[PDB]
Amino acid sequence: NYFMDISNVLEWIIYTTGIIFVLPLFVEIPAHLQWQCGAIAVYFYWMNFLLYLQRFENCGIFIVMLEVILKTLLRSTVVFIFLLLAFGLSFYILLNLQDPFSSPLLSIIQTFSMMLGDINYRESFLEPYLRNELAHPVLSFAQLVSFTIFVPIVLMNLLIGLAVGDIAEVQKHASLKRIAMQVELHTSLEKKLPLWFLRKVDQKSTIVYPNKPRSMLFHIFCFLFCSLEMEILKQKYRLKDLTFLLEKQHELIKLIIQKMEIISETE
Amino acid sequence: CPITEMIEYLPECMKVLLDFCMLHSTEDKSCRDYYIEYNFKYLQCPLEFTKKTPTQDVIYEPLTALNAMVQNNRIELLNHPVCKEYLLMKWLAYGFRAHMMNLGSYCLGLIPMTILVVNIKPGMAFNSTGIINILDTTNSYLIKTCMILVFLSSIFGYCKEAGQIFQQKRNYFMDISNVLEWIIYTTGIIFVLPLFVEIPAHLQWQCGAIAVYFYWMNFLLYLQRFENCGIFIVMLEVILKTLLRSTVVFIFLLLAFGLSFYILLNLQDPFSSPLLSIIQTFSMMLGDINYRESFLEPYLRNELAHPVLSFAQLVSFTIFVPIVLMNLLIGLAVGDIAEVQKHASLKRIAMQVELHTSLEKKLPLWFLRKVDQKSTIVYPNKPRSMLFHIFCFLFCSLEMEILKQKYRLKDLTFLLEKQHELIKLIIQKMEIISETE
Ligand SMILES: CCCCCCCC/C=C\CCCCCCCC(=O)O[C@H](COC(=O)CCCCCCCCCCCCCCC)COP(=O)([O-])OCC[N+](C)(C)C
Ligand SMILES: CCCCCCCC/C=C\CCCCCCCC(=O)O[C@H](COC(=O)CCCCCCCCCCCCCCC)COP(=O)([O-])OCC[N+](C)(C)C
Ligand SMILES: *CC(=O)N(CCCOC)c1nc(-c2ccc(OC)cc2)cs1
């Protein structure tokens, strides 16, 4: 049941790679492989260490917001791939004589770096144009203005709007989510402990002295640790009771007319 | 028809009517032989009323109840499991095959041009026997077949497009997808023509650039038919239309700053011509001002005519365009995306049911009689049929209450009026002795 879990996979990568980084105390290994593994291990240790901050109360809401934004980015990745591959192969054909666009894969990585707005207009477009070093100059400037309109303007603002919507959705229900994570942590931890330890550690009542201060280190830890629908439903209940009582009263009045005595008002 | 009437007026009774269409077999969820049956007898008309007939004057569009539920925004009925199984059956009947055929007929022209680009150095003239610089062999068997595939795909695209010309009859003129197909087909023809007529390499690569741009740009429009992707395409459409509405304010403000910098900074190379100055200010829009290179270092060498006016123009440009205008575009994008995601879950199922009800009107009636079904049987205990697992991994109210309140209060005041009339009748017919005067 643990196969569809990324935390297990991160632990596998960390443990194997940290084994290979340390093995020269038994078996001699070339230094290239050793530092190649040390890089991946030091990356994934501190990357995995964010997942242990989810258990705290002052931190876990940022981790769950980061999770939501990252999943939405994973949903947009296919539009990213196709649009970026379009612009990358177009710049590969247009700007072949320059060093950043020599290979197609280098051109794709260059357009991915140009995504944020580092276009390098003067170095790659203008100064080759003033030295007659651009084949197809008009097509090149038209490609430049089309790339500037599509990717850094439209797509980035799309990501910003998606992030704003997701963060508003998360912070709609933050205060319930915090206490839900705490009670889930305790009710999952309690199912594994033995029963005699539960009988020996629990309590049934607490006594709090508000005048006496609590027990320096605790002060530093405290510094680091720092409805219409139900109303209309009640309205509906009261109106239903009202119409029931009025029906009974109407029946009694018809009984009065049925049993009434009429003299000197007939015909 | 009363089913459409129930969808229009009382949808919560249609919910119960759909609840009668779900049958549980053994009422034991642990059994491996346990199943449930879905019946689809109320969701559509008989198929004879669908096709136009000289005897039957009236017609009905296919998927009747689903179209009626889409036009009345009854999403709680669309999320009912009988409707989900109905769309799943309708997709596995004929939708997947027609969709994969329509995608493959385009991908057959898409792939070989990308192969032909990434396996030939640009700028060189290439022919069926190889690359001319002397002739380079050892790839000619691949290059020849790729050029033949692109040529054949382009001429069959012409034939399909001319069929749509003689079919649609000038209603297709206000459509950008037809125009993109025209550009793709003509330009891919011109990129491949040296297997018949010799063409200079400059025109050949000039056409190859435009073709490889517009193939992958057009290929985004075929992702709109999927469910996991099309909402991004429609959000991109909305944002791009709003940018097209703001383009005139862009043009006037940018032309102001461009001609001002053309007059001020004439001695520098990026502002030599007026059109180059306009393109330079358009590039400076995002925040790449080049303060040190264009403003400060000419000032410390006494190379600026009008220095005070130049720095005032710099601070005015920095305030207007990268601060105000970009934040205006961000606010417009946030509002439009919130508006789209207000109605996402209805829009997805609406696109799916529109795709099926548009595809079904063209198929012949005997094929409809031979492919459809009336009931499905699902075994929840037995897993479905590796490749399917990879495909599943890649594929992963106050107003009505106050209205009811108003109805009940109106009934209440009607009954109280009748009761008041009866009490006045009691006083009219009552007998009074020993209480008179
Ligand atoms: C030209 C190129 C163009 C390319 C564009 C492509 C664009 C596409 C971009 C991104 C899409 C892919 C995202 C990859 C994983 C995201 C899912 C995820 O972690 O969310 C969830 C946590 O979310 C969090 O809040 C945790 C965040 C920390 C994890 C970071 C590890 C990443 C290191 C990799 C770097 C590798 C590089 C190595 C190089 C040396 C985990 O999933 P879950 O099951 O929901 O929750 C279970 C959580 N518990 C219970 C386990 C706690
Ligand atoms: C100094 C300069 C300053 C200038 C500032 C100017 C700023 C102005 C900027 C932009 C305004 C102009 C935008 C042009 C078209 C936008 C309309 C459009 O596609 O929306 C809709 C789709 O929307 C989508 O979601 C599809 C998106 C993909 C299409 C990309 C093709 C563009 C390539 C061109 C590049 C050319 C360069 C060539 C160079 C070699 C299509 O229209 P629709 O009818 O609503 O929907 C029908 C959709 N179906 C049914 C067909 C599916
Ligand atoms: C409203 C609609 O979609 N239906 C419901 C179908 C369920 O009952 C079979 C319609 N029914 C008719 C109809 C007309 C004539 C005949 O021939 C006997 C059958 C059904 C038209 S739409």
mmCIF file with all atom_site columns, N, CA, C and O and ligand atoms in Angstrom, chain B residues 1-5 40-46 48-49 60 63-65, ligand 3:
data_model
loop_
_atom_site.group_PDB
_atom_site.id
_atom_site.type_symbol
_atom_site.label_atom_id
_atom_site.label_alt_id
_atom_site.label_comp_id
_atom_site.label_asym_id
_atom_site.label_entity_id
_atom_site.label_seq_id
_atom_site.pdbx_PDB_ins_code
_atom_site.Cartn_x
_atom_site.Cartn_y
_atom_site.Cartn_z
_atom_site.occupancy
_atom_site.B_iso_or_equiv
_atom_site.pdbx_formal_charge
_atom_site.auth_seq_id
_atom_site.auth_comp_id
_atom_site.auth_asym_id
_atom_site.auth_atom_id
_atom_site.pdbx_PDB_model_num
ATOM   1  N N   . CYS B 1 1  ? -41.819 16.865 -23.635 1.00 0.00 ? 1  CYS B N   1
ATOM   2  C CA  . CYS B 1 1  ? -41.556 15.568 -23.027 1.00 0.00 ? 1  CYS B CA  1
ATOM   3  C C   . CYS B 1 1  ? -41.371 15.734 -21.522 1.00 0.00 ? 1  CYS B C   1
ATOM   4  O O   . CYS B 1 1  ? -40.647 16.641 -21.092 1.00 0.00 ? 1  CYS B O   1
ATOM   5  N N   . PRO B 1 2  ? -42.014 14.903 -20.697 1.00 0.00 ? 2  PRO B N   1
ATOM   6  C CA  . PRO B 1 2  ? -42.028 15.166 -19.252 1.00 0.00 ? 2  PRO B CA  1
ATOM   7  C C   . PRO B 1 2  ? -40.701 14.946 -18.551 1.00 0.00 ? 2  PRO B C   1
ATOM   8  O O   . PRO B 1 2  ? -40.534 15.444 -17.433 1.00 0.00 ? 2  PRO B O   1
ATOM   9  N N   . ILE B 1 3  ? -39.750 14.237 -19.161 1.00 0.00 ? 3  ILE B N   1
ATOM   10 C CA  . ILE B 1 3  ? -38.441 14.086 -18.534 1.00 0.00 ? 3  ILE B CA  1
ATOM   11 C C   . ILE B 1 3  ? -37.683 15.406 -18.571 1.00 0.00 ? 3  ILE B C   1
ATOM   12 O O   . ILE B 1 3  ? -37.078 15.819 -17.572 1.00 0.00 ? 3  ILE B O   1
ATOM   13 N N   . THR B 1 4  ? -37.737 16.106 -19.705 1.00 0.00 ? 4  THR B N   1
ATOM   14 C CA  . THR B 1 4  ? -37.159 17.440 -19.784 1.00 0.00 ? 4  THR B CA  1
ATOM   15 C C   . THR B 1 4  ? -37.893 18.419 -18.881 1.00 0.00 ? 4  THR B C   1
ATOM   16 O O   . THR B 1 4  ? -37.276 19.341 -18.336 1.00 0.00 ? 4  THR B O   1
ATOM   17 N N   . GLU B 1 5  ? -39.194 18.208 -18.680 1.00 0.00 ? 5  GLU B N   1
ATOM   18 C CA  . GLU B 1 5  ? -39.951 19.043 -17.757 1.00 0.00 ? 5  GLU B CA  1
ATOM   19 C C   . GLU B 1 5  ? -39.509 18.819 -16.319 1.00 0.00 ? 5  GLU B C   1
ATOM   20 O O   . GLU B 1 5  ? -39.409 19.775 -15.539 1.00 0.00 ? 5  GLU B O   1
ATOM   21 N N   . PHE B 1 40 ? -30.154 2.502  -18.692 1.00 0.00 ? 40 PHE B N   1
ATOM   22 C CA  . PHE B 1 40 ? -30.143 3.799  -19.351 1.00 0.00 ? 40 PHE B CA  1
ATOM   23 C C   . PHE B 1 40 ? -31.404 4.007  -20.176 1.00 0.00 ? 40 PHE B C   1
ATOM   24 O O   . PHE B 1 40 ? -31.358 4.551  -21.279 1.00 0.00 ? 40 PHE B O   1
ATOM   25 N N   . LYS B 1 41 ? -32.549 3.577  -19.661 1.00 0.00 ? 41 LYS B N   1
ATOM   26 C CA  . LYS B 1 41 ? -33.756 3.633  -20.470 1.00 0.00 ? 41 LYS B CA  1
ATOM   27 C C   . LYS B 1 41 ? -34.411 5.006  -20.476 1.00 0.00 ? 41 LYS B C   1
ATOM   28 O O   . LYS B 1 41 ? -35.179 5.299  -21.398 1.00 0.00 ? 41 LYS B O   1
ATOM   29 N N   . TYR B 1 42 ? -34.125 5.858  -19.495 1.00 0.00 ? 42 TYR B N   1
ATOM   30 C CA  . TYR B 1 42 ? -34.766 7.162  -19.416 1.00 0.00 ? 42 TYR B CA  1
ATOM   31 C C   . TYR B 1 42 ? -33.889 8.297  -19.914 1.00 0.00 ? 42 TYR B C   1
ATOM   32 O O   . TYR B 1 42 ? -34.359 9.434  -19.982 1.00 0.00 ? 42 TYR B O   1
ATOM   33 N N   . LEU B 1 43 ? -32.639 8.031  -20.261 1.00 0.00 ? 43 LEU B N   1
ATOM   34 C CA  . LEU B 1 43 ? -31.709 9.113  -20.547 1.00 0.00 ? 43 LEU B CA  1
ATOM   35 C C   . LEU B 1 43 ? -31.745 9.580  -21.991 1.00 0.00 ? 43 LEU B C   1
ATOM   36 O O   . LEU B 1 43 ? -31.168 10.628 -22.294 1.00 0.00 ? 43 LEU B O   1
ATOM   37 N N   . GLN B 1 44 ? -32.405 8.856  -22.889 1.00 0.00 ? 44 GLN B N   1
ATOM   38 C CA  . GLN B 1 44 ? -32.406 9.262  -24.284 1.00 0.00 ? 44 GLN B CA  1
ATOM   39 C C   . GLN B 1 44 ? -33.686 8.806  -24.962 1.00 0.00 ? 44 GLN B C   1
ATOM   40 O O   . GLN B 1 44 ? -34.347 7.863  -24.526 1.00 0.00 ? 44 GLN B O   1
ATOM   41 N N   . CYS B 1 45 ? -34.018 9.497  -26.047 1.00 0.00 ? 45 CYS B N   1
ATOM   42 C CA  . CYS B 1 45 ? -35.136 9.136  -26.890 1.00 0.00 ? 45 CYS B CA  1
ATOM   43 C C   . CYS B 1 45 ? -34.755 7.917  -27.726 1.00 0.00 ? 45 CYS B C   1
ATOM   44 O O   . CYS B 1 45 ? -33.581 7.547  -27.793 1.00 0.00 ? 45 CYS B O   1
ATOM   45 N N   . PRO B 1 46 ? -35.728 7.243  -28.346 1.00 0.00 ? 46 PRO B N   1
ATOM   46 C CA  . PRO B 1 46 ? -35.381 6.255  -29.371 1.00 0.00 ? 46 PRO B CA  1
ATOM   47 C C   . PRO B 1 46 ? -34.699 6.913  -30.561 1.00 0.00 ? 46 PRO B C   1
ATOM   48 O O   . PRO B 1 46 ? -34.978 8.061  -30.910 1.00 0.00 ? 46 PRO B O   1
ATOM   49 N N   . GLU B 1 48 ? -34.765 6.604  -33.734 1.00 0.00 ? 48 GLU B N   1
ATOM   50 C CA  . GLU B 1 48 ? -35.449 6.935  -34.977 1.00 0.00 ? 48 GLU B CA  1
ATOM   51 C C   . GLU B 1 48 ? -35.849 8.400  -35.026 1.00 0.00 ? 48 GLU B C   1
ATOM   52 O O   . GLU B 1 48 ? -35.901 8.992  -36.110 1.00 0.00 ? 48 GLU B O   1
ATOM   53 N N   . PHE B 1 49 ? -36.123 9.003  -33.872 1.00 0.00 ? 49 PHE B N   1
ATOM   54 C CA  . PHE B 1 49 ? -36.463 10.417 -33.814 1.00 0.00 ? 49 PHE B CA  1
ATOM   55 C C   . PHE B 1 49 ? -35.243 11.316 -33.917 1.00 0.00 ? 49 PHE B C   1
ATOM   56 O O   . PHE B 1 49 ? -35.401 12.531 -34.081 1.00 0.00 ? 49 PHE B O   1
ATOM   57 N N   . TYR B 1 60 ? -35.287 15.203 -32.614 1.00 0.00 ? 60 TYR B N   1
ATOM   58 C CA  . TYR B 1 60 ? -34.686 15.457 -31.315 1.00 0.00 ? 60 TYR B CA  1
ATOM   59 C C   . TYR B 1 60 ? -33.184 15.274 -31.435 1.00 0.00 ? 60 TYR B C   1
ATOM   60 O O   . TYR B 1 60 ? -32.718 14.339 -32.091 1.00 0.00 ? 60 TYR B O   1
ATOM   61 N N   . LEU B 1 63 ? -28.645 12.487 -27.069 1.00 0.00 ? 63 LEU B N   1
ATOM   62 C CA  . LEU B 1 63 ? -28.359 12.709 -25.650 1.00 0.00 ? 63 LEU B CA  1
ATOM   63 C C   . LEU B 1 63 ? -29.305 13.770 -25.081 1.00 0.00 ? 63 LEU B C   1
ATOM   64 O O   . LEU B 1 63 ? -28.891 14.861 -24.688 1.00 0.00 ? 63 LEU B O   1
ATOM   65 N N   . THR B 1 64 ? -30.595 13.424 -25.071 1.00 0.00 ? 64 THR B N   1
ATOM   66 C CA  . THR B 1 64 ? -31.649 14.401 -24.814 1.00 0.00 ? 64 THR B CA  1
ATOM   67 C C   . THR B 1 64 ? -31.615 14.898 -23.377 1.00 0.00 ? 64 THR B C   1
ATOM   68 O O   . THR B 1 64 ? -31.556 16.111 -23.127 1.00 0.00 ? 64 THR B O   1
ATOM   69 N N   . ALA B 1 65 ? -31.660 13.967 -22.422 1.00 0.00 ? 65 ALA B N   1
ATOM   70 C CA  . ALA B 1 65 ? -31.696 14.333 -21.015 1.00 0.00 ? 65 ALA B CA  1
ATOM   71 C C   . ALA B 1 65 ? -30.407 15.003 -20.578 1.00 0.00 ? 65 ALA B C   1
ATOM   72 O O   . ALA B 1 65 ? -30.439 15.912 -19.747 1.00 0.00 ? 65 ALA B O   1
HETATM 73 C C1  . LIG C 2 .  ? -38.119 13.057 -23.005 1.00 0.00 ? 3  LIG C C1  1
HETATM 74 C C2  . LIG C 2 .  ? -37.349 11.924 -23.686 1.00 0.00 ? 3  LIG C C2  1
HETATM 75 O O1  . LIG C 2 .  ? -36.158 11.967 -23.798 1.00 0.00 ? 3  LIG C O1  1
HETATM 76 N N1  . LIG C 2 .  ? -38.046 10.706 -23.918 1.00 0.00 ? 3  LIG C N1  1
HETATM 77 C C3  . LIG C 2 .  ? -38.011 9.678  -22.811 1.00 0.00 ? 3  LIG C C3  1
HETATM 78 C C4  . LIG C 2 .  ? -37.796 8.192  -23.231 1.00 0.00 ? 3  LIG C C4  1
HETATM 79 C C5  . LIG C 2 .  ? -38.164 7.127  -22.159 1.00 0.00 ? 3  LIG C C5  1
HETATM 80 O O2  . LIG C 2 .  ? -39.323 6.434  -22.570 1.00 0.00 ? 3  LIG C O2  1
HETATM 81 C C6  . LIG C 2 .  ? -39.118 5.456  -23.557 1.00 0.00 ? 3  LIG C C6  1
HETATM 82 C C7  . LIG C 2 .  ? -38.929 10.679 -25.068 1.00 0.00 ? 3  LIG C C7  1
HETATM 83 N N2  . LIG C 2 .  ? -39.851 9.762  -25.365 1.00 0.00 ? 3  LIG C N2  1
HETATM 84 C C8  . LIG C 2 .  ? -40.352 9.870  -26.720 1.00 0.00 ? 3  LIG C C8  1
HETATM 85 C C9  . LIG C 2 .  ? -41.028 8.714  -27.441 1.00 0.00 ? 3  LIG C C9  1
HETATM 86 C C10 . LIG C 2 .  ? -41.952 8.872  -28.494 1.00 0.00 ? 3  LIG C C10 1
HETATM 87 C C11 . LIG C 2 .  ? -42.503 7.802  -29.218 1.00 0.00 ? 3  LIG C C11 1
HETATM 88 C C12 . LIG C 2 .  ? -42.155 6.472  -28.932 1.00 0.00 ? 3  LIG C C12 1
HETATM 89 O O3  . LIG C 2 .  ? -42.700 5.430  -29.646 1.00 0.00 ? 3  LIG C O3  1
HETATM 90 C C13 . LIG C 2 .  ? -43.454 4.466  -28.939 1.00 0.00 ? 3  LIG C C13 1
HETATM 91 C C14 . LIG C 2 .  ? -41.240 6.279  -27.892 1.00 0.00 ? 3  LIG C C14 1
HETATM 92 C C15 . LIG C 2 .  ? -40.708 7.366  -27.187 1.00 0.00 ? 3  LIG C C15 1
HETATM 93 C C16 . LIG C 2 .  ? -39.758 10.915 -27.365 1.00 0.00 ? 3  LIG C C16 1
HETATM 94 S S1  . LIG C 2 .  ? -38.603 11.779 -26.419 1.00 0.00 ? 3  LIG C S1  1
#
